[PDB]
Write an enzyme that holds these catalytic residues in place. Sequence first.
Site, PDB file in Angstrom:
ATOM      1  N   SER A   1       0.853  -1.179   0.000  1.00 53.91           N
ATOM      2  CA  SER A   1       0.000   0.000   0.000  1.00 53.91           C
ATOM      3  C   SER A   1       0.888   1.227   0.000  1.00 53.91           C
ATOM      4  CB  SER A   1      -0.942   0.039   1.194  1.00 53.91           C
ATOM      5  OG  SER A   1      -1.496   1.334   1.328  1.00 53.91           O
TER       6      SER A   1
ATOM      7  N   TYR B   1      -3.017   0.331   9.898  1.00 50.63           N
ATOM      8  CA  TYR B   1      -3.075  -0.242   8.564  1.00 50.63           C
ATOM      9  C   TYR B   1      -1.755  -0.048   7.823  1.00 50.63           C
ATOM     10  CZ  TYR B   1      -4.412  -0.741   3.669  1.00 50.63           C
ATOM     11  OH  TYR B   1      -4.434  -1.058   2.318  1.00 50.63           O
TER      12      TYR B   1
END
Length: 248
Positions: A131, A144
């Site tokens: 990500s 996250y």
Amino acid sequence: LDFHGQTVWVTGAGKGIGYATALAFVEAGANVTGFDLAFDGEGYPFATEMLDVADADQVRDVCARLLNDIERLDVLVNAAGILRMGATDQLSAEDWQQTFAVNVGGAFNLFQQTMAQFRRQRGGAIVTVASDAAHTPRIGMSAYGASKAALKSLALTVGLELAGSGVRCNLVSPGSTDTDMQRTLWVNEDAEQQRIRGFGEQFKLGIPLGKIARPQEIANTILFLASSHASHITLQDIVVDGGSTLGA
Ligand SMILES: [Cl-]
């Protein structure tokens, strides 16, 4: 990009980036198996295996079963993942624990059950979906982004461990992408344009290419990294985000 006759596995293949990727491999000629927690659509253009990548025993069971019948696992794509948001001191314990069991443990379990296979056959390709949040701190996504940073590091060391066997191991790191998790999780209406502009107040840069990513655009980058066009590329991470991190 030709993949005819190759055995390709894709986790998180039920939705979003994982589905787009599994579909792209089919459109490239591959023999595709998608793994995910649920497959709630009535049909899928690939074979599907129900599987919780966080359940280490279920992963052992399904992989042992499928590895019995396939000669060779040409391509593994780790795309499983879940997004749980919140300020660091407000994140609930459940959100913290499941973030890591899925976003890191998932791959870990797949690596533990497949790495013998990659060593046996002496080749193939791995791509893991990290990500942009692993490249830059993100307000609201501390947990996250940290799981995806651990995922990246895991995947790179696995890559170093298998390079003796000739396995290439790379990552793609998406920025904002048009998905159902992203659509619903916006809610600000014109949220897509506010993301492109940026949020100076939260030190989040806009998107220089002036648009958010399409899932097919992540999937294509994965296909390149999995193909023999990338025959000298390993331990790399391609950020696919319109330039929003300025190359970080
Ligand atoms: Cl089973």
